[PDB]
């Protein structure tokens, strides 16, 4: 979900450059199961920018697979609920596919499922 917005962070090139400096590298994982609203896509990209900066300063990639797994299993599900529930969602929202970056307008969830 981190390759669709804020391209000036150059996450792809930064991952490649950190990996030119050692244990194997995995970029990038498949997030095709997810689709996020604009706000959540910015948030997860900014968070990944900050995480990658910490790794760059100390030249350490060993925790990257765990970060991707945490996104897949824990954080991206949280952002998905944020995007579809109040107070963020009213009526409908556009979710952007994490693999293709293409958007689809969908309805918000009912308060029953949200809370
Ligand atoms: C994000 O988008 C990917 C890309 O697939 C898209 O498919 C159409 C919606 C097009 O409009 C394109 O924009 C794009 O290529 C979605 O991945 C795809 O998921 C479908 C599962 O729904 C897979 O389609 C299949 O159809 C036949 C079965 O009839 C077989 O290929 C499979 O059994 C499967 O059902 C398709 O293979 C898959 N594509 C890839 C490359 O994974 C993805 O679902 C979507 N994610 C979200 C969250 O919306």
Author numbering: 17 to 37, 42 to 135
Sentences from the paper on this structure:
TMEM95 is a type I single-pass transmembrane protein. Tmem95 encodes a sperm acrosomal membrane protein, which relocalizes to the equatorial segment of the sperm head where membrane fusion with the egg takes place. Tmem95 knockout murine sperm, which have normal expression and localization of IZUMO1, can bind to, but do not fuse with, eggs. We propose that the interaction of TMEM95 with eggs facilitates membrane fusion of human sperm and eggs.
TMEM95 adopts an elongated rod shape, comprised of an N-terminal α-helical bundle (residues 17 to 110) and a C-terminal β-hairpin region (residues 111 to 135). TMEM95 shows homology to the N terminus of IZUMO1 (14, 15) with a Cα root-mean-square deviation of 7.2 Å and to the N terminus of SPACA6 (17). Unlike IZUMO1 and SPACA6, TMEM95 does not have an immunoglobulin-like domain at the C terminus. We found that the area surrounding the N-glycan is variable, while the opposite side harbors a conserved, positively charged surface. Our data suggest that the identified evolutionarily conserved, positively charged surface of TMEM95 may function as a receptor-binding site.
